[PDB]
Amino acid sequence: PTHLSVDTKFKTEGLCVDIPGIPKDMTYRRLISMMGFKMNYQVNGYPNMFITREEAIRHVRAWIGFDVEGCTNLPLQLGFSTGVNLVAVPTPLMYKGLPWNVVRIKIVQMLSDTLKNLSDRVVFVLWAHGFELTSMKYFVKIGPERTCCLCDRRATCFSTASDTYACWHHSIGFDYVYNPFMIDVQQWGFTGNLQSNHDLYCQVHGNAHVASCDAIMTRCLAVHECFVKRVDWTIEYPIIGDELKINAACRKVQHMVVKAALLADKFPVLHDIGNPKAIKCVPQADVEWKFYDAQPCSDKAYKIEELFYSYHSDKFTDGVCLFWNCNVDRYPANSIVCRFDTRVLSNLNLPGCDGGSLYVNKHAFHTPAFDKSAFVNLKQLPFFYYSDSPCESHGIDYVPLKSATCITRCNLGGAVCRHHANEYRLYLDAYNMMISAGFSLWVYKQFDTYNLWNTFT
Ligand SMILES: CNC(=O)C1(Cc2ccccc2F)CC1
Ligand SMILES: CNC(=O)C1(Cc2ccccc2F)CC1
Ligand SMILES: [Zn+2]
Ligand SMILES: [Zn+2]
Ligand SMILES: [Zn+2]
Numbered sequence: 434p435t436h437l438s439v440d441t442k443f444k445t446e447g448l449c450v451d452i453p454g455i456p457k458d459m460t461y462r463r464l465i466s467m468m469g470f471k472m473n474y475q476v477n478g479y480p481n482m483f484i485t486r487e488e489a490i491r492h493v494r495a496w497i498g499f500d501v502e503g504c505t506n507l508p509l510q511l512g513f514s515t516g517v518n519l520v521a522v523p524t525p526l527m528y529k530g531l532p533w534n535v536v537r538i539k540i541v542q543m544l545s546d547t548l549k550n551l552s553d554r555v556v557f558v559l560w561a562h563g564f565e566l567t568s569m570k571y572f573v574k575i576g577p578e579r580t581c582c583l584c585d586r587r588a589t590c591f592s593t594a595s596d597t598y599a600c601w602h603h604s605i606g607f608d609y610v611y612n613p614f615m616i617d618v619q620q621w622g623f624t625g626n627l628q629s630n631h632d633l634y635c636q637v638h639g640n641a642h643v644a645s646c647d648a649i650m651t652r653c654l655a656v657h658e659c660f661v662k663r664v665d666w667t668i669e670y671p672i673i674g675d676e677l678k679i680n681a682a683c684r685k686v687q688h689m690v691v692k693a694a695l696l697a698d699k700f701p702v703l704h705d706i707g708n709p710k711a712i713k714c715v716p717q718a719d720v721e722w723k724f725y726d727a728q729p730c731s732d733k734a735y736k737i738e739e740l741f742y743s744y745h746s747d748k749f750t751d752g753v754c755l756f757w758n759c760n761v762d763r764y765p766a767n768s769i770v771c772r773f774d775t776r777v778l779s780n781l782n783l784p785g786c787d788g789g790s791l792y793v794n795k796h797a798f799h800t801p802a803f804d805k806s807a808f809v810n811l812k813q814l815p816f817f818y819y820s821d822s823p824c825e826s827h828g829i830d831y832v833p834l835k836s837a838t839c840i841t842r843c844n845l846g847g848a849v850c851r852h853h854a855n856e857y858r859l860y861l862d863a864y865n866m867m868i869s870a871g872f873s874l875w876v877y878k879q880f881d882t883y884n885l886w887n888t889f890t
Contacts (some may be wrong), residue, residue, distance in 0.1 A: 436480045436488070437461065439472070447619040451503075451563020458522060463708075469570035475645040477577030479612050484556065489616045491668060492658050492785065495552035497544065498652030499615075501564035502531075502644045509568060511536065512644025514652040515547050515560070521571070525641065534608070537572040541590050541607045549601035550673065550780045553587050555614040560627045560651045574609040586608065590613070608750030611812065618655050630654055632659070637802075657786040660799040662733050669795060674780050676794050680872045682863035687714045687757055687771070690874065693819045693840075694753060694769055695720050697884035698877075702752035706740060707759035720752075727759055731789075731799035735758045741765075753877070760801055768809035770875040775803045792871070803873075814874035816864060817882045818857045821889070824850035834858070840882060842889045 435588060439462040444641045453553050456463075470482065489496070489645040508530050511519040519539060520530035528539075544555050559565055560809040567587050571624045579588035586600035599607055629639050632656045633652040638649050643708030692715045695703070702721040705711060709726035720723060723746060727735065741749050754768045764770050775782070775790035783791045788802030834854035836844070841857075843850040849857070868874075 435785065436825065437483050437485045439465065439481050440676050443617075444620060447561055448563045448566075458611065464566070468566050469767075470573075470575050472575075475577055478659075479575065479578055481727050482613070482615055485746045486615050486616070486621070486659065487557055488614075489558075489655070490665070490797075491670075492552060492554060492556055492614070493656075493659070493791065494670070494673070494793060495548065495554045495556040495614070496558050496652055496783075497547065497555055497657065498648035498650075498655075499557040499559055499565055500644045500647040500651065501568050502647070504566055509564060510644040511540075511568065512646070512648040514648045515543060515585075516643070516645050516649070517543055518643050518645045521568070525643065525645065527643070527735075537608045537610075537731040538606075539612060541570050542608070544610065544792040545601040545604045545607075548589075551783075555610065555613045557613060558652045558655045559615060560619050560647065560654075569590045572610055573613055574611050576612065578612065590813075616655075616725075618651055618664065621658065627651060628653070637786075637788045643778070653784075653786050656791060656799070660791055660797055661786055661789075664731055664799075666796050666798075668797065670793050670797065675866065675870070676781065678866050679781075679794065679861075681769075682870075683872065684866040685859055685860065685863045686716070686867050686874070687772055689819060690814065690876070691715050691755060691769060692718065693817070693885060694876070694880065696819075697752070697881065701748055701750040702750050704746065704752060704754045706754060706756055708757075711757075714755075714757075729758065729798055730760050730801060732801065733840065734801045734804070737761050737763055737765065759805065760866060762804075763807055763809065764811055764875065768811055768875070768879050769877070770808070770811060772803070772807070772873050773800050774871045774873050775800050777869075779871060782871060808875050810878075812878050812880070814876040814880070815882070816861070818860045819882070819885050820853055820856060822852075822856075824852055826851045829855065833856075838882070840885045845886055846887050 440460050443459045443464050445459045449455050461481055465482055500512040502510045506511055509521045510519060517526045519528050519536050521533050521536045522530040524532045538544040581588055581600040581603050588611055589601055590599045590604035591609040591611040592607040598611060599856055600778040610644055619776045627647055627650055631654045635653055638653055640646050695718045700720060706725045707727055713722050754765055756764060756768055756770045758771055775816035781794050785791045785799055790800050792798045792800055817838045817840055824843050831851055834849045839849055839857045841853045843853055
């Protein structure tokens, strides 16, 4: 129960229009052989080109939808979920017809640039009809598991010019994809074609009829099945960037913003709606803290009418509501909100289904599409740093800080002390880290930082 057995059956029905006469009885072992690959009883970490659904989910950062549409004398259109379309000749980025020896070079360049900061491998996500599997021998080479010639990462590319192997970071000028993975979505038990199944859940990807459109719809449908309709928050993903800093920044911003709203507007009660594991972000606040459980929505954003109504203080209008990563359709006017913006471009955020995005930071979270109208009763929360801690350096070099948003006793009394200048700059860094990761902060309209200066009287 580790890898997908080569002796597992492969339903070949989807393959019979490009490959008429294909045997109904078929295994992975016979399919790989038919694709032109020899596995030679090799016990070297590459037991099968095809992988299980569970392995595909653990390597979601490696997913690249691939589709081949025909144009012996058949020129092929090679579509990738990066939006790239290459034309191979036997001899929405649309490239003219070229022979395989140059096409394979462009393929290694594209996958290397797309994946070097995401994953140690490639997973071709297919809706297999025939031509994509038969085309693989023209750009893929297989063998035992290898390491890069320039480093210790696993080898993902091969060069017939130098006879060496490279990872995605060192494969400049390499021509073959080495030991790729693949999964046929059509093997999951679907009725109807790709578009009919895709269009049931997503109105964002259309069918222009080019190979890359299908490659996009395939990866999208695969993401919906594995992360929208089925959610598994137990699967851990490796650290590939600023994960730890972003998470630390998020907890610092939360404490700061909630601590200041309770000081400025002195709400008697706070309704904390979201994560059933949540802890009081401001443990020393006077306020009555009431929790309401709601797991992260992955399909559509929660309707505020279902979260609140149907008969808890019952009066959510009393006090303030804290929606920290709790994605609802329209926030009530008395709210403190942290909403992830799915449009953000990063190595942590991968494209999702129906405008949503798959945010992968320790765990995978499909987030519904960012909608500006959710925030009509609120305003954008401005940057501010508040601190009531004593001015005492205790224990890096200095330049005097001058800022209208440093809300401290020292700034009230004229000059900012070294301690609050160091802490203000660290907090500004954490804030910029969090904003740039895609998170966006919103607050009730009466929120004024001018009300914080009187907490120094
Ligand atoms: C167009 N057909 C092919 O090139 C063949 C190999 C082949 C490749 C992939 C899957 C099944 C298969 F049978 C029959 C030779
Ligand atoms: C550019 N075309 C090719 O290299 C051919 C083989 C071929 C490979 C994959 C799918 C269908 C196919 F017909 C026609 C020779
Ligand atoms: Zn390397
Ligand atoms: Zn889609
Ligand atoms: Zn100070």
